[PDB]
C-alpha cells in the first residue's frame, strides 16, 4: 500500500512575466486584425528616434521625451537593410523609430505592430518608470484613413474590456502624425475612461523621410501614394489595469512572491 | 572538477502530435485573417450532419459519405442551445454540420474555422483512413461575395507555399453550396497542383433550415439577408505533403519513433 495523498517529486514549474503576458494578449488581439509582430533595437540612432519622425533638435517637442545618451567606440549600429548607420547614439525613447526602420525595409500595403523596451530619463515611482514597454502599430496602403485608425482601437477595446467597452478619440499632438490624437477606452468594470495611447494619419514627412533613406540606399520610393495610421500604447498601464497591479515598480523589481502570481494566468 | 560533458538528469522531454500541428498551423493562417476557431460534437444527429446540410435520404449525394451509424440508450445529444436534440446517431462525416450549429446559435457577420475528427466508413491504406480530421470555414455577412471566398483561399496557399504559390477553383458539387468549387493550391517545390478542399457560397436552403431551427426554438430568423462561403480541407493529406510523412496510417500508430520526429516542429 501507498500513501496516495502525500507530495511527489518536486519538479520545477515555470511560469511567464506579467509584461510576457499582457504583450502577447495585445498581439494576439492584433494577429486578429492582420497585423503582424516584428522588432526593433533598443540602442536606436538620432536619426531614428528623432529625425526620420519630425523631431528635431531644440524643438519644444523634444522635450515629450527624456533621453538617455549614450557612450563608447566599437559599437555597431545596423539599419534596416543590414547597413552600418551612424549618428547620436540613445536608448529609444519609443518604439516609433522602428516603424521608419520597417518602412525602408518593406512595401505598402502592410499591417504590423511592433512591442518593444523603452527608455526614458525619469524618477521611478509608484506609477512612472524610466524602463517600460509600448506596443506600436503601423498600418501604411492606399486609401488608408483616419475612420480605419478609429475602427482598429475600437476592436481593442471590444476585445480588452468586452461589448460594453466604448473608445475615445481627442485631439493631440505628435510630431510624427496629422491629424494627431489621443485614445481612452472606456472599462465598465472600473466605471472609467483609460487614457491608453496616442495615435493618427502618419505624417507627409514621415513618408518623405523614408523614401529618401531609401533613395539613398538605391531602393526605389514606395511611399508616395499611400497613406496611414500609427498609434502608440504602454503596456504597464495596461498590465497593472488589467491584473490588479499596484506598483509599476514590481515589474523589474524580480521578487519571485510577485513574479510567482502569474503562473495561472495562461 | 567535474565532467561537465556528461549526460544530465533524465528528465523527461514532451512533444506535440502531427496533426496538432498542422492544425494549430491552419489555425493561425486563419486567425491572421480574423476568422476564430469553435468545435463541435464527434457523435452527430443525422439532422445536422445531414438534413440540415441540404442532403436527403436515398439522394446519390449521401454516397459522397460512408457513414457509421451508432446505436444505444442513455446518450444525451445537447444541441447548439444546449436544448435535447433528436435523430439517429452517428459519427460526423465531415465538421459541416457545426456550420449549422454554429449559426443557430449566434448572427452574423462573422469568420469560423471548426477543426475536427471525422469518421467515414473505409478501408485504411497508405493514403486512407477511416478516422481523420478537416478543417471548416464559413464566413457570413452582408454582401460576402465568392470573390472572397477565393480571397481566403489565396492567402491560404500564400500563408502555406510562399510568393510563388496560386491557387485554382473549378466547379464541383455539394449540397450545402451554389456555386459549388473544389480548389487547388500550387506547390512550387513539388511542383505539383493539390486538390486541397471544396466550398463555394452557402446554399439557400442552409440558411432556411438554420432560421427554422431557431424559430423553432423561440429565436428570430438571422439569415434573411446576408450570404456567406463556406470551405472544408482535409487534415492529413496537407500534414503529409508538410512533414513528408509517407503512410497517413502513421498518425493514430502511436508509434513514439514516429511522434518522437515532431518533437522539433515549433
Ligand atoms: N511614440 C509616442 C506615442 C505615439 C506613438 C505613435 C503615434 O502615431 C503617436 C504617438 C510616445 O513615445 O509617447
Ligand atoms: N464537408 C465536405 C467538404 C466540403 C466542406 C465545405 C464546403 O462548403 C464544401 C465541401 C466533405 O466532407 O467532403
Redesign the interface.
Given at each position: 500500500r501507498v500513501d496516495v495523498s502525500l507530495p511527489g517529486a518536486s519538479?520545477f514549474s515555470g511560469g511567464l512575466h506579467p509584461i510576457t503576458l499582457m504583450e502577447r494578449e495585445l498581439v494576439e488581439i492584433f494577429?486578429?486584425?492582420?497585423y503582424?509582430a516584428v522588432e526593433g533595437p533598443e540602442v536606436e540612432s538620432e536619426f531614428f528616434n528623432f529625425d526620420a519622425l519630425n523631431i528635431p533638435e531644440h524643438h519644444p517637442a523634444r522635450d515629450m521625451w527624456d533621453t538617455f545618451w549614450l557612450t563608447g567606440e566599437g559599437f555597431r549600429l545596423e539599419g534596416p537593410l543590414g547597413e552600418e548607420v551612424e549618428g547620436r547614439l540613445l536608448l529609444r525613447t519609443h518604439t516609433s523609430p522602428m516603424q521608419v526602420r520597417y518602412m525602408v525595409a518593406h512595401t505598402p500595403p502592410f499591417r504590423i505592430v511592433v512591442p518593444g523596451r523603452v527608455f526614458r530619463f525619469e524618477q521611478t515611482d509608484a506609477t512612472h518608470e524610466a524602463v517600460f514597454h509600448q506596443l506600436e502599430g503601423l498600418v501604411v496602403g492606399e486609401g488608408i484613413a483616419m475612420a480605419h485608425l478609429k475602427g482598429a482601437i475600437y476592436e481593442l477595446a471590444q476585445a480588452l474590456f468586452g461589448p460594453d467597452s466604448k473608445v475615445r478619440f481627442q485631439p493631440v499632438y505628435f510630431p510624427f502624425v496629422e491629424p494627431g490624437a489621443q485614445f481612452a477606452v472606456w472599462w465598465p468594470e472600473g466605471g472609467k475612461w483609460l487614457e491608453l495611447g496616442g495615435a493618427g494619419m502618419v505624417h507627409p514627412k514621415v513618408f518623405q523621410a523614408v523614401d529618401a533613406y531609401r533613395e539613398r540606399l538605391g531602393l526605389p520610393p514606395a511611399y508616395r501614394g499611400v497613406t496611414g495610421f500609427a498609434f502608440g500604447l504602454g503596456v504597464e498601464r495596461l498590465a497593472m489595469l488589467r491584473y490588479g497591479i499596484p506598483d509599476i515598480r514590481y515589474f523589474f523589481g524580480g521578487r519571485l512572491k510577485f513574479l510567482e502570481q502569474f503562473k495561472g494566468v495562461l
Open positions: 519538479l494577429r486578429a486584425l492582420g503582424q
